[PDB]
């Protein structure tokens, strides 16, 4: 099987950390005893020294390869990187062949200790431009209600975190949803039918749906104060209703891995939320879900509770056997061992954090999508920017009826403009594929003149001039 091009590059590099000679070393200069030996990239002591709170899963893959492959014979190639299962094997390899009549300890799911995950799949989410997500908050500034979107992007290496993958996003697509002041809830059938055609155009453009965003602002008084502070240390970090939508999105998009026995493991999916800081701004934060316990129990046992920090655990009806969930908390006198014989266990423990950021404006490798970021989006029907062909006379117009190719190609690289053109499918699919590849790639000057000489682009500007 074949993995991603980014995932195979992190596997080949060892990522060792070099050290220097010290006063504690008693050996010679041409050697190393223990104090200047090469440090492994999975040691968590070096991680918390530089305030890195997770061990960068590609290095966690290396720390399990040392346990799988040894100096001894072995002759196995097991590679035990699989999803730990809480479901019940029906055959059970014993005399209690039905679960209605019989269950023993080798098939019973053990009591969940609630230990936090030490490794994250995505180590650092990054963005492309501050003007891209400024249009997303501007949707709230016009209708006053919450929004929703899906992030399309790619992946590359990250040199800050040892053996880490960074998440790059390029554009944000919004599905048609019904907004509300308190929260939001849309139909999953019309979104999945709409997201199927966007994945078609994302393949030729080199994009993949790897993220989503949802807003939560609660403006205070619209004067000096920006927003309220809903999510803090004493309150919930992520609501339990949005854990369900984050869990189903990770199971729909698996990550291919040759080390896993099933063929897919350790999904690379980000969930970002606009919530605001403690003091005064609308700074965002992102956390992703845990694979070890939460990713498998969401198929059978997650039920909604009235508290945003916790989630209710329901009962067993003849196939849905669940084990007891335990966690430690302080009582009125001291700190005690596991107490939970009670439902509504918290879900903030099962989240691992990420580091969001925006790159510097002075230099970058590329940006690939900065045309205007002011074009009316596809499914923004709550706002007034959902126009017909009247907008195409205002937006591009083949500027001033005779456009220069340095000023014409800079507008054609928009994500939602190219996704609006092919829906009319005036051009051929072969000429459309070279149209979107010219706008997204470099050395575009020889191929842009091929587009203007084609009869399909001439019919597009002729059918636009007669219409309003």
């Amino acid at each position: 099987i074949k993995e991603l091009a980014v995932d195979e590059e992190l596997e080949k590099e060892d990522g060792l950390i070099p050290r220097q000679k010290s006063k504690l070393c008693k050996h010679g200069d041409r050697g190393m005893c223990e104090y200047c030996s090469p440090l492994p990239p999975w040691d968590k002591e070096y991680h918390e020294k530089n305030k890195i709170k997770h061990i960068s899963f590609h290095s966690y893959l290396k720390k399990l390869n040392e346990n799988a492959n040894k100096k001894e014979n072995g002759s196995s190639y097991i590679s035990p990187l699989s999803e730990p299962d809480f479901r019940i094997n029906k055959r059970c390899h014993n005399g209690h062949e039905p679960w209605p009549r019989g269950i023993c300890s080798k098939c019973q799911p053990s009591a969940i200790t609630l230990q936090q995950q030490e490794f994250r799949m995505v180590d650092h989410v990054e963005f492309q431009k501050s003007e891209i997500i400024n249009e997303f908050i501007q949707a709230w500034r016009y209708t006053g209600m919450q929004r929703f979107g899906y992030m399309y992007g790619s992946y590359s290496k990250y040199d800050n975190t040892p053996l880490g993958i960074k998440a790059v996003v390029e554009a944000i697509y919004e599905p048609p949803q019904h907004d509300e002041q308190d929260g939001l809830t849309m139909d999953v059938e019309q979104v999945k039918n709409e997201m199927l055609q966007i994945d078609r155009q994302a393949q030729e453009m080199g994009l993949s749906r790897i993220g989503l965003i949802f807003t939560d602002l609660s403006d205070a008084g619209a004067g000096d104060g920006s927003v309220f502070c809903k999510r803090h240390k004493d309150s919930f970090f992520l609501s339990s209703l949005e854990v369900i939508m984050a869990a189903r999105h990770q199971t729909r998009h698996p990550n291919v891995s040759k080390y896993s026995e099933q063929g897919f493991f350790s999904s690379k999916f980000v969930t970002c939320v606009i919530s605001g800081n403690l003091e005064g701004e609308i700074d965002i934060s992102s956390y992703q879900v845990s694979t070890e316990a939460e990713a498998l129990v969401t198929a059978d046992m997650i039920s909604g509770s009235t508290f945003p920090s916790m989630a209710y655990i329901n009962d067993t009806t003849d196939e849905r056997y669940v084990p007891e969930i335990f966690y430690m908390k302080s009582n009125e006198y001291g700190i005690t061992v596991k107490e939970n014989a009670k439902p509504a266990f918290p879900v903030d423990y099962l989240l691992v954090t990420l580091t969001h950021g925006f790159p510097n404006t002075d230099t970058e490798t590329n940006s690939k999508f900065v045309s205007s970021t002011g074009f009316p989006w596809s499914n923004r029907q709550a706002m007034g920017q959902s126009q017909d062909y009247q907008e195409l006379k205002k937006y591009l117009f083949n500027v001033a009826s005779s456009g220069d190719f340095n000023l014409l190609h800079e507008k054609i690289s928009n994500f939602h403009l190219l996704l609006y053109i092919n829906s009319l499918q005036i051009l051929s699919p072969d000429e459309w594929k070279l149209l979107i590849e010219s706008a997204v790639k470099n050395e575009w000057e020889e191929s842009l003149l091929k587009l203007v000489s084609s009869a399909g682009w001439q019919t597009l500007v002729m059918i636009l001039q007669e219409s309003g």
Binding site: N50, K51, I52, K53, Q115, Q116, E126, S130, N134, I137, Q138, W140, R141, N160, D219, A222, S226, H232, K233, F237, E281, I282, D283, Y287, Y327, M328, K329, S330, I335, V337, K338, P346, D348, Y349, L351, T353, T355, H356, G357, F358, P359, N360, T361, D362
Partner: protein
């Protein structure tokens, strides 16, 4: 003109490895981790 001989016996250990109270993890989430060089994080304003 005689002797006294007696042996001994030991029990080594058991462990549980229980840690990570919930109040330490809630303080563990709300912090920062550092950002390379020019990876500003931004502010924003609106809703006049």
């Amino acid at each position: 003109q005689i002797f006294v001989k007696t042996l001994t016996g030991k029990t080594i250990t058991l462990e549980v490895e229980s840690s990570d109270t919930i109040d330490n993890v809630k303080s563990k989430i709300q912090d920062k981790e550092g950002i390379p060089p020019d990876q500003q994080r931004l502010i924003f304003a609106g809703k006049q």
